[PDB]
């Protein structure tokens, strides 16, 4: 205690409980280990199986396909009639009801819909793929409209907006993908108030809808409207009155997906589901 | 022919192109537009904190036998949040039909059941609160955080025990040493009065290469637990008076390997 | 509050401070307690009204 101290002094600001909301900072914790220097490996090779990449990152939820349902055809079926019709935003839920022996219920989402929920804006583009199935006698013509904003509450012309003609042919299994056409730069997220989600997609065989009429009204969360017309009618060689045919779509994200954003809105919810009815 | 098997691939990788809606024109400097900064990244953002399932010990105030009189509380519990619901086992109402588990979804127990292996240490913050009802209010006390290593025999079990310190003379040395341990890996200690704030990181200590993440049982995500534990005075034997708040994230080597596939959910009200 | 009505646009972040009192008017003072801020996100459905619940 030879010399003293001539320092000027300083500001504290104690700061007991520390930074909560930050992820950058370096933290002031106590590791409860030996050394303060212990670390595993961040491989993803440790488990047996070869890496892609970064399986932590995003954009392997944005771009990993999902099949969602399926509609029909119908051969007799007039030369304009509604077949499909969707709202382009990723949140689509499916409801089932435990086929089994018991009460429950539950939701699923897509890749992109399920890693959008913890987030409360979305931009980017969105793809789609119909696949026919049918036999090599089968000929036909169908029609994909998308609307930018309103919505398709009548039959539209074919050049009036973005269209496209495909025929059923020696190829199926048509893909198509949707971009951004919005006068805003981002969207809102879709929620949930109850267990029972509202209808956002037109007949589903799975889900155990079949009306043909257009719903909307969606437009603060969607990137407009998706349908599909007949052009010209199914032909098979047996005959008709008692044929039909299926298409199965997919979704799934462009690599042009964003979400930035931080919401609270799956605070209460769990994926268990099993027993909650008793 | 050869244009319907190729189309048939896994992935939608022989389907046909079809001249996209629009086109893609984003610039750089978008980020300084709006938002400030990008969310890519989904390993940055599980490092911040949640809030998530406050501690009690509202389960030993039954029995009419509860030691009073400055005891100690402690409470075991696992290490990672354990989703909330109903869950098999419970931690929150264990003598009574259909325990359930009275927490919230954070953002680790909702991006990881999808996934096939977890690796990594978890961090831990621990904010102390409580009245008296009556009584004037007492001192804080002192509050420890220690591992529970793993044993073949005589291991600790999950949560809410509570021991006696006091006899008729006083403080006794021989019962303050039956309601500690050695502490060989554990304990980190501190006094609430002038700091009710606890911050600690558990490492993984496995054996094996990684864990489960859509394990749903309290018990079998239990197998790493650690233990929370006050000392305070002039309590009640049929009260609960002190509770924790727990605030949970990812620590530096957290990992998750494989995306399987997202399962079901549903809404769940308590 | 000033400034700000002479002009069309407006953008950027807010800094708060926030100073805690209070007594009890007899019933003598009990320990002050914790305190929280925490944001408020848009969500199209069952958003936080504005003020004042206990």
Redesign the interface.
């Known amino acids: 205690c030879r010399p003293v101290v001539i320092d000027p002094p300083h500001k504290y600001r104690p700061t007991?409980?520390?930074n909560?909301?930050?992820?950058?900072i370096a933290?002031?914790?106590?590791?409860?280990?030996?050394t303060s220097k212990?670390?595993?490996?961040?491989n993803?090779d440790?488990?047996g199986?070869k890496?892609d990449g970064?399986?932590?990152?995003?954009?392997?939820?944005f771009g990993?396909?999902a099949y969602m349902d399926r509609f029909e055809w119908k051969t007799t079926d007039s030369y304009d009639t509604l077949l499909f019709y969707t709202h382009v935003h990723p949140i689509l839920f499916k409801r089932?009801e435990a086929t089994s022996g018991d009460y429950d219920?539950?939701?699923?989402?897509?890749?992109v819909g399920?890693?959008t929920?913890?987030?409360?804006?979305w931009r980017g583009?969105m793809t789609f793929?119909f696949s026919i199935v049918a036999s090599?006698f089968h000929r036909g013509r169908l029609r994909i409209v998308?609307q930018p904003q309103g919505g398709l509450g009548t039959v539209p012309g074919f050049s009036a907006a973005?269209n496209?003609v495909?025929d059923l042919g020696?190829?199926?299994?048509?893909?198509?993908?949707?971009?951004?056409?919005q006068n805003i730069?981002?969207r809102?997220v879709?929620?949930?108030?109850?267990?029972v989600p509202s209808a956002q997609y037109t007949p589903g065989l799975d889900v155990g809808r079949t009306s043909q009429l257009p719903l909307g009204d969606q437009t603060?969360?969607s990137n407009g409207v998706l349908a599909v017309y007949v052009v010209n009618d199914l032909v098979s060689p047996d005959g008709g009155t008692d044929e039909s045919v299926e298409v199965n779509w997919?979704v799934?994200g462009?690599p042009?997906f964003?979400?930035?954003?931080?919401?609270?809105?799956?605070?209460?919810?769990?994926?268990?589901?099993?027993?909650?009815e008793? | 022919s050869p244009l319907a098997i190729a189309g048939n691939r896994a992935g939608g990788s022989g389907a046909i192109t079809l001249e996209p809606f629009g086109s893609d024109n984003t610039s750089p400097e978008l980020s300084k537009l709006h938002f400030g900064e990008t969310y890519d990244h989904m390993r940055v953002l599980v490092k911040g904190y949640n809030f998530y399932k406050a501690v009690l010990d509202n389960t030993t105030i039954t029995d009419p036998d509860n030691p009073s009189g400055t005891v100690v509380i402690r409470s075991t519990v696992p290490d990672f949040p354990a989703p909330r619901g109903h869950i098999p086992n419970g931690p929150d109402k264990p003598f009574l039909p259909h325990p359930e588990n009275a927490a919230l979804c954070t953002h680790l127990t909702w991006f990881s059941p999808c996934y096939v292996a977890r690796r990594g240490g978890i961090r831990w913050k621990y904010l102390h609160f409580g009245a008296r009802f009556g009584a004037t209010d007492a001192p804080k006390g002192l509050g420890f955080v220690n591992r529970v290593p793993q044993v073949p025999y005589g291991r600790r079990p999950l949560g809410n025990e509570r021991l006696p310190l006091t006899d008729v003379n006083g403080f006794n040395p021989t019962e303050l040493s039956q309601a500690f341990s050695n502490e060989n890996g554990g304990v980190y200690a501190t006094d609430l009065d002038v700091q009710p704030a606890i911050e600690v990181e558990l490492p993984f200590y496995s054996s094996l290469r990684f864990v489960n993440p859509r394990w749903d049982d309290y018990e079998k995500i239990g197998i790493h637990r650690h233990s929370i534990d006050l000392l305070s005075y002039r309590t009640n034997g049929a009260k609960c008076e002190d509770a924790w708040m727990a605030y949970v994230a990812a620590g530096d080597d957290f990992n998750l390997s494989w995306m399987l596939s997202c399962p079901p959910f549903r809404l769940v009200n308590l």
């Open positions: 007991y409980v520390g909560m909301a930050n992820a950058d933290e002031a914790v106590d590791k409860l280990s030996l212990q670390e595993l490996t961040i993803h440790v488990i199986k890496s970064d399986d932590m990152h995003l954009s392997t939820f990993r396909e089932f219920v539950g939701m699923l989402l897509p890749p399920y890693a929920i913890p987030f409360s804006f583009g793929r090599a998308y973005f496209r495909i020696d190829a199926r299994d048509f893909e198509v993908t949707v971009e951004w056409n730069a981002f809102e879709h929620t949930t108030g109850s267990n603060s969360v997919f799934k462009a042009s964003e979400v930035a954003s931080r919401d609270t809105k799956f605070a209460r919810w769990s994926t268990h589901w099993s027993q909650e008793f």
